[PDB]
């Protein structure tokens, strides 16, 4: 409220910060004056905690912070990041900017954290700074999760925890010793500057420590002497300060003992800090071998030039600090009996400027050097209890993963709650609130997640991320488990959605791809493993059901949207299952017990789909016809090969018999099971006397839109099955398949395309072109010229179109 | 061959305990334990074999059903390992009791030629003990403990073993031969694959630092796929044993290329140039980095009709071999394998010394001191340094100061005073020979190679033995005697060499130490001091005179035979032991022919051509060069 | 005698104690580093149970 505070808040704003955050080039190269720029952050993070300021005031201190930790390095902001995680989970509206400063500071050092190595220049953190942004993380999540919904706040934490979710290494095993003996500054949660000691007159000294504090008193009371006599201090027996003259430089020997204390006494009170957080000296035997040693010169040692160990360094860094803390609560005292003014030192330790920390340096300095001349070996006063490091459990992403099943698991039941209540009146729920954060963070936290560490994902020890971090397997049939539930979550469920179900499709699609379910196959838990063939088989069926009444209801709304659920997430959604299965070879496996049963009824159902006609088929054509190479490319036996697939060993019918399966009421026979499909040869027969015919696409579009890319599917998955890849095993194998095969198929391509260029035409060739790339790829450069530069002599002599084509 | 209690009890101890040492073996292995269930015990599954397969024994002939015992892939992974163990503990038992190993059996020399690695031992044996094993842990899980498998380890250590602290050798042409204008082209055909990197290097390329990690070379890690300058992208392929890397190069437009068993290499982006813009600066030649096990071959392009993907990639682009018209082979250029002793540079990252003169009451002194210390990348590990000037012991050996013992004296003094906090234990003084190329992070007293020359008499008597080293040190650990550390008299080693008999003694803070060396006649001794980086200030040399000792520079120099005086001119400076320093493959090398004349005959070695090469010996350094 | 060191896969052979040896200059066989032959002495070493 003081009015000179505003004016220098309007100075500082409108010259200091503006010219800082002009200078954010200069501010790079800062490891020399690391100590006071972190001093800098933490007094501009103080000044951004002001009340008073101004919107203007405030947006300015936002852009010169942000603008100056984003080049400024992370191995400097630690020390401002420990305040910043801590005072976050309050969520006020104050904290945005902090959360902004995050948000951006975890993308710019994504590499850092991300990468065990990180820069090279930068390192890797010392992965406490890993702990604390863990601690971060959850504490963001789960405040977020039980802060109630505002817009603007989910906006802007989302990017946030995206970002710390990318940047810390999922493998990252929790550290065994969880992190306490923090200062009570940091667990003040008012400012931060209560600077209370520990309570140390408890602990008494040992017979090593008093003789260590012997003949250090004497080094001190040396050296001071050679202070005195250098201000003027004479050997005079009177201690006249005017005349400079003192009788004190008698050896501490011949000191008074009165004179020792308050001179040793503070000696004393460092040592009882020393073992008060409880580190354990050891002295070596040349402590006490000099001690029976008792020319010789009763001067000081210089320790300039020997320096401490860097762990050492670290423990008198918080030891400068509680001598600090010490001497900020004497000065306190002092400030509630002066009763008026402000100190102007009152800031915390890690506030501080090193040139006045240079006398708490130099104090700990000189004394963990003289305890390790004398020979006490200072560590910690006690290692690590032990080691759980063979628990994956305490794994970054395996406990995140944990309490996202446990949320998933949540959602799942707020769904169950939501269906009961859609039955009733009531579409409005205080529920609804923990919905919106549920579908607004979790799930594209789980996209940002699993597109980061997607390879993390596929990482299972056999070398995704050669540097290590895999996923475990159980990790990654907990994994598929959440798979399966987010299904449950979308299983009709739009209406309950705020028509945001595309997000979690696309959630679904990229999960899908990270998908690494065939080691789960080989190992993985049999629940899990049946629940995943549930859904394969509930997906299914919901398919089915749908292509069936909506022929028996083609004639014509409950299962109307049921329908259109079905061809616009679910075919969509199985369709990119099928996609990573073929692309990642992955999923055979998977396709093995009912599963084949199952996916020969689904492909009868979409060649049903494809050979009919309807509007909304001519509206999902493209879905219809990327949904059938799908499952062609997902699919394991060559379904045309019916006269010899009883020669396919890893068909299900030679691998478990049949035996059970002919008893129960099915064909049991793959031509039995497909009499609607044609087979390889008729439809080869078929698809080159239409092309030769050169009908345009209106009359058969069919053709084109589906069966053409599922051939062309087909023909890529089956090209190392046929002989026209490998002519060993020629019988000892299911398929045979010749490359002229597909080389009839493409030149009847190039044929269609002939035929086509003159009229009709649309976005058909383009993703038909699109799917023949890798057809393409197989093709010989040899039938490329010739076959082909005719034919790009056609794509080019239709200089009147303007139809964009390859 | 009986039941238990006739079978003798001895034995019946050591199969008991062998038993309880396997099942250790099986919780060392972290095996969890756990039975389904006691009446599975409780009711024993037994089946009997055949008269002849029956026994004394009224155990049934083959209780456990072969059948049902289908052991588990873990299991069988485990019990190899559990063999390893157990072939370990029987060669460990064979090692206490003396054996050795003998390519033959023998029982006088007493030595086993199955006393080897499992891993190479007999197969029948192996599968032997190892079928017993099998038959022993599968019964072990049948007889109703259920044991749970441990944990499927994955962890390797990926070789990453690599003799000596060298890690990969940097194989250059010929500084001479660098292009600073035109196009070129040579081939790298790599024979194995692995951390192998292939490019172009200025002629400033050092062979220490890795290749492309600097400014100076230009690489391709194929093994990773990785472009290299000034740090790492990606670009390429990896390769496969026995792929080409073709280098290709144009200095007009400063473009580099790279292409694999013929095809173009690709960057991340659509652009077929690695590299898009340098400098010509001093020129390029070729280089190739060679990790650990790898086997590569340049192919410079002297015989045209050599490189075989030239004429697909190269040859119609314009490109010219970079041996395109030279009528001698290119003289290649690789990493030294030796340390060598090279003066401090002003410009080292770590090293500073700084010239003392030596005024009227001070004596000249060199210190050295380390600048980056504090800092990040600070350097803990040891550094040897040594003068640049020998003394000579003599030819033969003979079998306030008095100015005339001075004049006829021998004896050479310099001392070293490790700075006040400068940890003693982690430094050495004394002298070292000019055969001192060793380096170890860890340099310990024991480790000094010696040799003991032990002349005899007729009858074998040693009447003359002979001590050989090339390090005779001290440390100043125990040469902190008296104990603590003087900050009015640092600590303060003085080395005396008495040239005229080869007595070499140490004196610490005026105390004669103990330890004193005997030398051969006519040896070079180099100063030395040897040092672990534990402050600002490590150490300096004092070229001071101690009463009735010559001075340093009056053995080290001739014009200053009998100069009492202390000088230390500028010849002398310190030097320290490094590895950037390159080596020269002769252009021929000797016609050596080997081969198997017969059984009786043995291998007959047979070299019948002269070759030579002029040496040029640098006189101070006792140490030559082609 | 030396020719019971060899090791059982092996053969005794007489060969250049240092790597390089005389031939074509692009059939010459740059070797990198070496793995340190410390497999060759078998010590046995049992596991502490
Ligand atoms: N299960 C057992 N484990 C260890 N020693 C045993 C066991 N059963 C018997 N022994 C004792 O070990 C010795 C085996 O004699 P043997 O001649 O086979 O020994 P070896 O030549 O030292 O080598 P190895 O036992 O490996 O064939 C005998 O002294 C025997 O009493």
Redesign the interface.
């Given at each position: 409220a003081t009015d000179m505070a505003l004016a220098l808040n309007r100075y500082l704003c409108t010259a200091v910060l503006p010219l800082l955050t002009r200078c954010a080039p200069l501010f790079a190269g800062t490891?020399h004056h690391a100590s006071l720029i972190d001093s800098l952050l933490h007094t501009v993070y103080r000044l951004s905690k002001g009340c008073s300021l101004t919107k203007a005031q405030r947006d300015s201190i936002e852009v010169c912070l942000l603008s100056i930790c984003g080049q400024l390095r992370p191995s400097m902001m630690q020390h401002l990041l420990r305040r910043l995680v801590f005072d976050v989970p309050l969520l006020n509206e104050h904290a945005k900017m902090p959360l902004k400063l995050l948000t951006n500071h975890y993308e710019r050092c994504w590499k850092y954290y991300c990468l065990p190595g990180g820069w090279?220049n930068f390192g890797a953190a010392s992965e406490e700074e890993l702990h604390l942004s863990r601690k971060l993380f959850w504490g963001i999540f789960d405040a977020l999760s039980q802060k109630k919904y505002e817009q603007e706040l989910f906006k802007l934490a989302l990017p946030c925890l995206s970002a710390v979710a990318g940047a810390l290494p999922p493998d990252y095993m929790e550290s065994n010793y969880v992190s306490m003996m923090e200062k009570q500054s940091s667990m003040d949660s008012e400012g931060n500057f209560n600077p209370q000691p520990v309570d140390t007159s408890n602990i008494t000294i040992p017979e090593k420590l008093e003789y260590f504090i012997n003949k250090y008193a004497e080094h001190s009371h040396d050296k001071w002497s050679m202070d005195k006599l250098a201000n003027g201090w004479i050997y005079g027996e009177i201690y006249s300060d005017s005349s400079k003259v003192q009788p004190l430089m008698k050896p501490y020997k011949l000191l008074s003992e009165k004179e020792k204390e308050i001179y040793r006494w503070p000696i004393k009170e460092s040592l009882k800090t020393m073992l008060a957080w409880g580190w354990r000296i050891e002295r070596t035997r040349?402590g006490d071998?000099?001690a029976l040693?008792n020319g010789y010169?009763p001067?000081?040692?210089?320790?300039?030039?020997?320096?401490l160990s860097r762990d050492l360094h670290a423990m008198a860094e918080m030891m400068a600090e509680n001598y600090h803390n010490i001497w900020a609560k004497k000065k306190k005292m002092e400030l509630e009996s002066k009763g008026g003014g402000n100190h102007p030192l009152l800031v915390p330790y890690d506030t501080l400027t090193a040139k006045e920390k240079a006398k708490d340096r130099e104090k700990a300095q000189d004394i963990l050097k003289f305890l390790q001349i004398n020979g006490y070996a200072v560590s910690r006063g006690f290692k690590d209890l032990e080691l759980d490091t063979?628990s994956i459990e305490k794994r970054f992403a395996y406990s995140f993963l944990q309490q996202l099943i446990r949320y998933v698991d949540e959602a799942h039941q707020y769904i169950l709650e939501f269906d009961g209540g859609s039955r009733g009146k009531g579409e409005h729920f205080p529920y609804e609130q923990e919905i919106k954060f549920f579908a607004k963070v979790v799930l594209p936290l789980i996209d940002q997640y699993f597109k980061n560490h997607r390879l993390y994902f596929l990482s299972a020890?056999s070398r995704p991320l050669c540097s290590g971090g895999?996923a475990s397997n159980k990790e990654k049939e907990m994994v598929t488990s959440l798979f399966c539930k987010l299904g449950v979550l979308v299983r009709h469920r739009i209406s309950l959605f705020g028509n945001d179900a595309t997000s979690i499709v696309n959630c679904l699609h990229i999960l899908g791809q990270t998908l690494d379910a065939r080691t789960v196959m080989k190992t993985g838990l049999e629940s899990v493993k049946s629940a995943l063939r549930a859904f394969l088989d509930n997906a299914a069926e919901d398919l089915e059901k749908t292509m069936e009444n909506l022929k028996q209801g083609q004639f014509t709304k409950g299962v109307t949207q049921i329908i259109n659920y079905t061809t616009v997430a679910l075919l969509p959604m199985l369709s990119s299952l099928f996609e990573h299965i073929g692309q990642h070879q992955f999923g055979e496996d998977l396709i093995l017990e009912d599963v084949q049963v199952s996916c020969y009824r689904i492909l009868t159902s979409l060649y049903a789909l494809g050979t009919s006609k309807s509007i909304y088929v001519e509206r999902q054509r493209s879905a219809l016809g990327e949904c059938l190479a799908a499952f062609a490319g997902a699919f394991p036996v060559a379904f045309l090969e019916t006269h010899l697939d009883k020669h396919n060993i890893y068909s299900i019918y030679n691998t478990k018999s049949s035996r059970e399966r002919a008893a129960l009421s099915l064909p049991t026979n793959v031509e039995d099971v497909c009499p609607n499909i044609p087979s390889l040869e008729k439809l080869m027969e078929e698809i080159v006397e239409l092309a030769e015919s050169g009908i345009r696409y209106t009359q058969m579009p069919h053709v084109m839109e589906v069966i053409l890319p599922m051939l062309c599917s087909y023909m890529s998955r089956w090209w190392e099955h046929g002989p026209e890849n490998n002519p060993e095993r020629a019988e000892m194998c299911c398929t045979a398949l010749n490359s002229e095969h597909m080389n009839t198929l493409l030149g009847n391509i190039l044929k269609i395309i002939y035929n086509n260029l003159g009229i009709d035409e649309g976005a058909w060739m383009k993703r038909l072109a699109v799917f023949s790339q890798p057809i393409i790829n197989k093709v010989k450069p040899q039938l490329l010229k010739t076959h082909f530069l005719p034919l790009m002599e056609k794509l080019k002599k239709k200089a009147a179109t303007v139809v964009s084509e390859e | 061959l009986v039941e238990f209690s006739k079978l003798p009890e001895q034995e019946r101890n050591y199969n008991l305990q062998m038993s309880l040492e396997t099942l250790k073996t099986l919780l060392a292995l972290g095996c969890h334990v756990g039975i389904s269930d006691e009446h599975a015990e409780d009711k024993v599954k037994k089946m009997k074999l055949p008269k002849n397969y029956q026994l004394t024994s009224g155990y049934k002939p083959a209780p456990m059903d072969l059948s049902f015992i289908k052991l588990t892939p873990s299991q069988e992974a485990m019990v190899d390992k559990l063999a390893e163990n157990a072939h370990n503990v029987w060669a460990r038992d064979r090692i206490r009791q003396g054996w050795t190993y003998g390519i033959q059996q023998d029982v006088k020399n007493r030595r086993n030629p199955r006393l080897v690695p499992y891993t190479l031992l007999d197969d029948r044996t192996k599968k032997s003990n190892k079928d017993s094993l099998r038959e022993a842990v599968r019964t072990l899980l049948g007889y109703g403990y259920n044991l749970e498998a441990p944990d499927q380890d994955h962890a390797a250590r990926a070789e990453v073993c690599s003799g000596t602290g060298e890690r990969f050798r940097i194989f250059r042409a010929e500084k001479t031969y660098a292009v600073k204008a035109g196009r070129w082209y040579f081939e790298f055909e790599t024979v194995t694959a692995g951390d192998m990197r292939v490019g172009w290097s200025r002629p400033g390329c050092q062979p220490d630092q890795e290749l492309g990690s600097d400014e100076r070379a230009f690489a391709f890690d194929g093994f990773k796929a990785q472009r290299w300058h000034q740090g790492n992208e990606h670009y390429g392929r990896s390769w496969q044993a026995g792929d080409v890397v073709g280098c290709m190069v144009d200095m007009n437009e400063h473009t580099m290329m790279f292409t694999l068993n013929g095809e173009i290499l690709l960057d991340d982006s659509g652009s077929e140039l690695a590299f898009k813009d340098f400098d010509v600066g001093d020129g390029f030649i070729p280089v190739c980095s060679l990790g650990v096990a790898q086997v590569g071959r340049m192919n410079f392009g002297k015989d045209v009709s050599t490189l075989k993907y030239f004429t697909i990639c190269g040859l119609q682009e314009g490109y010219e071999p970079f041996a395109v018209n030279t009528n001698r082979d290119i003289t290649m250029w690789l990493s030294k394998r030796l340390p060598q002793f090279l003066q401090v540079p002003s410009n080292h990252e770590h090293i500073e010394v700084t010239r003392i003169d030596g005024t009227i009451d001070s004596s000249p002194c060199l210190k050295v001191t380390q600048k980056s210390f504090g800092s990040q990348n600070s350097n803990t590990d040891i550094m040897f340094y040594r003068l640049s000037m020998p003394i000579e012991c003599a030819e033969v050996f003979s079998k306030r100061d008095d100015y005339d013992f001075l004049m006829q004296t021998s004896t050479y003094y310099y001392s070293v005073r490790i700075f006040p906090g400068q940890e003693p234990a982690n430094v050495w003084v004394g002298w070292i020979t000019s055969d001192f190329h060793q380096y170890d992070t860890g340099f310990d007293l024991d480790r000094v190679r010696t040799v003991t020359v032990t002349l005899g008499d007729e009858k074998g008597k040693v009447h003359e033995s002979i001590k050989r080293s090339n390090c005779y040190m001290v440390c100043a650990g125990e040469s902190m005697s008296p104990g603590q550390g003087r900050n009015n008299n640092g600590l303060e080693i003085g080395c005396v060499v008495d040239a005229a008999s080869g007595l070499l003694t140490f004196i610490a803070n005026g105390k004669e130490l103990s330890t004193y060396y005997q030398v051969e006649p006519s040896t070079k001794l180099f100063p030395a001091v040897f040092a672990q980086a534990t402050s600002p200030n490590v150490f300096q040399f004092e070229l001071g005179r101690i009463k009735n000792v010559m001075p340093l520079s009056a053995g080290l120099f001739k014009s200053e035979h009998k100069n009492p005086v202390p000088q230390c001119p500028p010849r002398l400076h310190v030097q320290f032991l490094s590895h950037v320093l390159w080596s020269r493959m002769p252009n021929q090398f000797l016609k050596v022919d080997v081969s198997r004349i017969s059984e009786r005959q043995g291998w007959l070695v047979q070299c019948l051509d002269p070759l030579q090469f002029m040496s040029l010996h640098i006189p101070e350094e006792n140490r030559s060069v082609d | 005698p030396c020719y019971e060191a060899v090791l059982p896969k092996e053969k005794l052979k007489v060969e250049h104690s240092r790597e390089y040896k005389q031939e074509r200059t692009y059939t010459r066989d740059l070797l990198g580093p070496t793995v340190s032959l410390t497999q060759a002495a078998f010590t046995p070493i049992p596991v502490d149970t």
């Amino acid at each position: 409220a003081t009015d000179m505070a505003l004016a220098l808040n309007r100075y500082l704003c409108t010259a200091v910060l503006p010219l800082l955050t002009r200078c954010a080039p200069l501010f790079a190269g800062t490891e020399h004056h690391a100590s006071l720029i972190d001093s800098l952050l933490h007094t501009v993070y103080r000044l951004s905690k002001g009340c008073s300021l101004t919107k203007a005031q405030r947006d300015s201190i936002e852009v010169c912070l942000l603008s100056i930790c984003g080049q400024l390095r992370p191995s400097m902001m630690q020390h401002l990041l420990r305040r910043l995680v801590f005072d976050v989970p309050l969520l006020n509206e104050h904290a945005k900017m902090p959360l902004k400063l995050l948000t951006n500071h975890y993308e710019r050092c994504w590499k850092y954290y991300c990468l065990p190595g990180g820069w090279g220049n930068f390192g890797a953190a010392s992965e406490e700074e890993l702990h604390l942004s863990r601690k971060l993380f959850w504490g963001i999540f789960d405040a977020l999760s039980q802060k109630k919904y505002e817009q603007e706040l989910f906006k802007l934490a989302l990017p946030c925890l995206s970002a710390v979710a990318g940047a810390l290494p999922p493998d990252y095993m929790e550290s065994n010793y969880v992190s306490m003996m923090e200062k009570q500054s940091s667990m003040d949660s008012e400012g931060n500057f209560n600077p209370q000691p520990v309570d140390t007159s408890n602990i008494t000294i040992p017979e090593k420590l008093e003789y260590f504090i012997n003949k250090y008193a004497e080094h001190s009371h040396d050296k001071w002497s050679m202070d005195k006599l250098a201000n003027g201090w004479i050997y005079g027996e009177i201690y006249s300060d005017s005349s400079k003259v003192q009788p004190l430089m008698k050896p501490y020997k011949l000191l008074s003992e009165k004179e020792k204390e308050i001179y040793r006494w503070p000696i004393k009170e460092s040592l009882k800090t020393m073992l008060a957080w409880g580190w354990r000296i050891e002295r070596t035997r040349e402590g006490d071998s000099m001690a029976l040693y008792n020319g010789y010169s009763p001067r000081a040692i210089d320790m300039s030039n020997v320096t401490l160990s860097r762990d050492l360094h670290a423990m008198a860094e918080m030891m400068a600090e509680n001598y600090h803390n010490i001497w900020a609560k004497k000065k306190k005292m002092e400030l509630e009996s002066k009763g008026g003014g402000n100190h102007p030192l009152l800031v915390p330790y890690d506030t501080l400027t090193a040139k006045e920390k240079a006398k708490d340096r130099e104090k700990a300095q000189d004394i963990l050097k003289f305890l390790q001349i004398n020979g006490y070996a200072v560590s910690r006063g006690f290692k690590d209890l032990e080691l759980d490091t063979p628990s994956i459990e305490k794994r970054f992403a395996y406990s995140f993963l944990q309490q996202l099943i446990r949320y998933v698991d949540e959602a799942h039941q707020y769904i169950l709650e939501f269906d009961g209540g859609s039955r009733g009146k009531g579409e409005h729920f205080p529920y609804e609130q923990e919905i919106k954060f549920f579908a607004k963070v979790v799930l594209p936290l789980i996209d940002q997640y699993f597109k980061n560490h997607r390879l993390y994902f596929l990482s299972a020890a056999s070398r995704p991320l050669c540097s290590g971090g895999h996923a475990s397997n159980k990790e990654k049939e907990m994994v598929t488990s959440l798979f399966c539930k987010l299904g449950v979550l979308v299983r009709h469920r739009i209406s309950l959605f705020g028509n945001d179900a595309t997000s979690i499709v696309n959630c679904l699609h990229i999960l899908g791809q990270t998908l690494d379910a065939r080691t789960v196959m080989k190992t993985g838990l049999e629940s899990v493993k049946s629940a995943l063939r549930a859904f394969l088989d509930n997906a299914a069926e919901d398919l089915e059901k749908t292509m069936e009444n909506l022929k028996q209801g083609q004639f014509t709304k409950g299962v109307t949207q049921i329908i259109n659920y079905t061809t616009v997430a679910l075919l969509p959604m199985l369709s990119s299952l099928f996609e990573h299965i073929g692309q990642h070879q992955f999923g055979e496996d998977l396709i093995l017990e009912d599963v084949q049963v199952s996916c020969y009824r689904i492909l009868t159902s979409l060649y049903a789909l494809g050979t009919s006609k309807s509007i909304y088929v001519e509206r999902q054509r493209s879905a219809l016809g990327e949904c059938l190479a799908a499952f062609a490319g997902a699919f394991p036996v060559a379904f045309l090969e019916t006269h010899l697939d009883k020669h396919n060993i890893y068909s299900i019918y030679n691998t478990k018999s049949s035996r059970e399966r002919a008893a129960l009421s099915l064909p049991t026979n793959v031509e039995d099971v497909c009499p609607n499909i044609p087979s390889l040869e008729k439809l080869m027969e078929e698809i080159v006397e239409l092309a030769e015919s050169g009908i345009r696409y209106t009359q058969m579009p069919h053709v084109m839109e589906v069966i053409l890319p599922m051939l062309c599917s087909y023909m890529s998955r089956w090209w190392e099955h046929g002989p026209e890849n490998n002519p060993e095993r020629a019988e000892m194998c299911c398929t045979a398949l010749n490359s002229e095969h597909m080389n009839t198929l493409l030149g009847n391509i190039l044929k269609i395309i002939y035929n086509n260029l003159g009229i009709d035409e649309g976005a058909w060739m383009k993703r038909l072109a699109v799917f023949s790339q890798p057809i393409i790829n197989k093709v010989k450069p040899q039938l490329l010229k010739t076959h082909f530069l005719p034919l790009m002599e056609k794509l080019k002599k239709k200089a009147a179109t303007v139809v964009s084509e390859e | 061959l009986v039941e238990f209690s006739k079978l003798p009890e001895q034995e019946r101890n050591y199969n008991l305990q062998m038993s309880l040492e396997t099942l250790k073996t099986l919780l060392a292995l972290g095996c969890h334990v756990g039975i389904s269930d006691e009446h599975a015990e409780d009711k024993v599954k037994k089946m009997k074999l055949p008269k002849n397969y029956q026994l004394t024994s009224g155990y049934k002939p083959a209780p456990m059903d072969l059948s049902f015992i289908k052991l588990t892939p873990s299991q069988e992974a485990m019990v190899d390992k559990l063999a390893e163990n157990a072939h370990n503990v029987w060669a460990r038992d064979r090692i206490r009791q003396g054996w050795t190993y003998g390519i033959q059996q023998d029982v006088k020399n007493r030595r086993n030629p199955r006393l080897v690695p499992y891993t190479l031992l007999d197969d029948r044996t192996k599968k032997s003990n190892k079928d017993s094993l099998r038959e022993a842990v599968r019964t072990l899980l049948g007889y109703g403990y259920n044991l749970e498998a441990p944990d499927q380890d994955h962890a390797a250590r990926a070789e990453v073993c690599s003799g000596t602290g060298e890690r990969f050798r940097i194989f250059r042409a010929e500084k001479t031969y660098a292009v600073k204008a035109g196009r070129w082209y040579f081939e790298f055909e790599t024979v194995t694959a692995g951390d192998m990197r292939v490019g172009w290097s200025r002629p400033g390329c050092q062979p220490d630092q890795e290749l492309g990690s600097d400014e100076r070379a230009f690489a391709f890690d194929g093994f990773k796929a990785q472009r290299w300058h000034q740090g790492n992208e990606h670009y390429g392929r990896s390769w496969q044993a026995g792929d080409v890397v073709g280098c290709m190069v144009d200095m007009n437009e400063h473009t580099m290329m790279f292409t694999l068993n013929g095809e173009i290499l690709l960057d991340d982006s659509g652009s077929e140039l690695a590299f898009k813009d340098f400098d010509v600066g001093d020129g390029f030649i070729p280089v190739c980095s060679l990790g650990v096990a790898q086997v590569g071959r340049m192919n410079f392009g002297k015989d045209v009709s050599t490189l075989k993907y030239f004429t697909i990639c190269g040859l119609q682009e314009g490109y010219e071999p970079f041996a395109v018209n030279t009528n001698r082979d290119i003289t290649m250029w690789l990493s030294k394998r030796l340390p060598q002793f090279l003066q401090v540079p002003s410009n080292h990252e770590h090293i500073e010394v700084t010239r003392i003169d030596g005024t009227i009451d001070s004596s000249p002194c060199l210190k050295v001191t380390q600048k980056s210390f504090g800092s990040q990348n600070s350097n803990t590990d040891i550094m040897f340094y040594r003068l640049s000037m020998p003394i000579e012991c003599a030819e033969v050996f003979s079998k306030r100061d008095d100015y005339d013992f001075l004049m006829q004296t021998s004896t050479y003094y310099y001392s070293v005073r490790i700075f006040p906090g400068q940890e003693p234990a982690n430094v050495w003084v004394g002298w070292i020979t000019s055969d001192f190329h060793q380096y170890d992070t860890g340099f310990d007293l024991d480790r000094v190679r010696t040799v003991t020359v032990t002349l005899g008499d007729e009858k074998g008597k040693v009447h003359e033995s002979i001590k050989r080293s090339n390090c005779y040190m001290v440390c100043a650990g125990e040469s902190m005697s008296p104990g603590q550390g003087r900050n009015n008299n640092g600590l303060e080693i003085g080395c005396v060499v008495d040239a005229a008999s080869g007595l070499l003694t140490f004196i610490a803070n005026g105390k004669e130490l103990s330890t004193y060396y005997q030398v051969e006649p006519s040896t070079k001794l180099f100063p030395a001091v040897f040092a672990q980086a534990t402050s600002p200030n490590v150490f300096q040399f004092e070229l001071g005179r101690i009463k009735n000792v010559m001075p340093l520079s009056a053995g080290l120099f001739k014009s200053e035979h009998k100069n009492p005086v202390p000088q230390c001119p500028p010849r002398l400076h310190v030097q320290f032991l490094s590895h950037v320093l390159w080596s020269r493959m002769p252009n021929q090398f000797l016609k050596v022919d080997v081969s198997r004349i017969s059984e009786r005959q043995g291998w007959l070695v047979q070299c019948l051509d002269p070759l030579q090469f002029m040496s040029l010996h640098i006189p101070e350094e006792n140490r030559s060069v082609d | 005698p030396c020719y019971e060191a060899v090791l059982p896969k092996e053969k005794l052979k007489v060969e250049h104690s240092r790597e390089y040896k005389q031939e074509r200059t692009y059939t010459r066989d740059l070797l990198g580093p070496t793995v340190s032959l410390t497999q060759a002495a078998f010590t046995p070493i049992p596991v502490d149970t």
